[PDB]
């Protein structure tokens, strides 16, 4: 028929504003600006659960870390920025950590490690020679190319803590 069109308004979200510091407070707050950068810079520190805040030239670190080291590094990087006078650690570990681990009662442990040494040797053919321990008695059975490789095998077998005696049964070619 005829022209109708539509009526639509316009909005200016991005306008210019060339202003500066005429009378605003930006001193301690300006210190946190670099601190949050030092926290995110370190992969070892999850700044996601860390709240940084500067109060009277003192940067307070509070939140939840994975381990102690995570927090220890946080306070270091925070104090690494220029402007901060002191850092207050208020971070808390949320995960569990131990200190003294232990194994179990089993002579097989000697065999487990004795093998790791024999195969790591430059002459002891642990690939063809097997070792087993009984009551702390390390026994080596198999075949070697020469006595040089035989002797070495036993040399380490008796060197492993927990062994009471060694029994070289590996034959030579």
Dist. CA 151–CA 113, nearest whole Å: 18
Ordered by where they begin, the domains of the chain are 29-93 (3.30.1340.30), 108-172 (3.30.1340.30)
How far apart CA 24 and CA 28 sit, in angstroms, is 12
3-state secondary structure of 140: strand
Which backbone phi and psi does 34 adopt, to 5 degrees? -90, -30
Q: How far is CA 133 from the centre of its chain?
A: 35
Measured between alpha carbons, how far is 173 from 154 in angstroms, rounded to an integer? 17
Buried b (16+ CB within 10 A) or exposed e, 74-97: bbebbeebeebeebeeebeeeeee
Q: Which of 14, 66, 19 is nearest to 45 (CA)?
A: 66
Q: What technique was this entry resolved by?
A: NMR
Nearest residue to 172 via CA among 150, 156, 155, 140: 150
- Token pair belonging to 138: 């390390």
C-alpha span between 168 and 17 (Å, rounded):
88
The DSSP-derived string for 51-110 is: EEEEETTEEEEEEEESSHHHHHHHHHHHTTSTT--EEEE--EE-S---S-----S-THHH
CB-neighbour burial class of residue 38 (10 A; exposed 0-12, middle 13-18, buried 19+): buried
CA 165 to chain CA centroid, Å, is: 39
- Integer-rounded Cα radius of gyration of the chain: 34
Q: β-strand 130-134 against 92-93: which pairing, if any? A: unpaired
Name the 3-class secondary structure at 22: coil
Query: How many residues comprise the chain?
Result: 173
Cβ-based burial of 49 (10 A; exposed 0-12, middle 13-18, buried ≥19): middle
Whole-angstrom Cα distance, residue 74 to residue 61? 8
> What would the two tokens of residue 128 be?
């063809």
């Amino acid at each position: 028929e005829n022209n109708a069109q539509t009526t639509n308004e316009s909005a200016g979200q991005k306008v210019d504003s060339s202003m500066n510091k005429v009378g605003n407070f930006m001193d301690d707050s300006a210190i946190t600006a670099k601190v949050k950068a030092a926290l995110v810079d370190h992969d070892n520190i999850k700044s996601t659960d860390i709240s940084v805040k500067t109060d009277q030239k003192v940067v307070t670190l509070s939140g939840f870390v994975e381990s102690q080291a995570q927090a220890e590094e946080a306070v270091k990087v925070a104090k690494g920025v220029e402007g901060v006078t002191s850092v207050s650690d208020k971070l808390h570990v949320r995960d569990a950590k131990e200190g003294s681990v232990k194994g179990y009662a089993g002579d097989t442990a000697t065999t487990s490690e004795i093998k790791a040494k024999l195969l790591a040797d430059d002459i002891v053919p642990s690939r063809h020679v097997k070792v087993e321990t009984t009551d702390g008695v390390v026994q080596l059975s198999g075949t070697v190319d020469s006595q040089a490789q035989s002797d070495r095998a036993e040399s380490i077998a008796k060197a492993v803590d927990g062994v009471k005696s060694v029994k070289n049964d590996l034959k030579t070619k």
